[PDB]
Amino acid sequence: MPHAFKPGDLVFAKMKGYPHWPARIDDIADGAVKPPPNKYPIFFFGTHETAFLGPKDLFPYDKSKDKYGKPNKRKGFNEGLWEIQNNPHASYS
Numbered sequence: 001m002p003h004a005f006k007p008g009d010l011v012f013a014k015m016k017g018y019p020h021w022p023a024r025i026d027d028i029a030d031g032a033v034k035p036p037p038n039k040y041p042i043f044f045f046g047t048h049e050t051a052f053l054g055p056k057d058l059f060p061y062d063k064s065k066d067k068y069g070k071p072n073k074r075k076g077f078n079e080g081l082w083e084i085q086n087n088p089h090a091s092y093s
Contacts, residue, residue: 046080
């Protein structure tokens with residue numbers, strides 16, 4: 001039975017204007033900017049961008065990969081697919 005989202009969780013994350021995108025829930029570093037309430041820090045594989053999203057835009061990676069885990073013309077996407085499959089917990093700084 002599912003829990004709330006926690007840092008380390010792998011997802012596809014949905015932003016307007018973009019396809020469902022390989023991502024993870026990030027930690028917040030000591031001293032770093034906190035997200036707004038009820039939002040999560042989302043790290044997008046491939047582009048290495050961070051956005052703040054709520055659960056309605058977060059789809060568990062395992063359940064959704066068959067649908068969303070296919071190659072895409074969009075910049076960074078295919079790099080993103082490799083990262084989430086091959087080293088999803090790596091430092092990408």
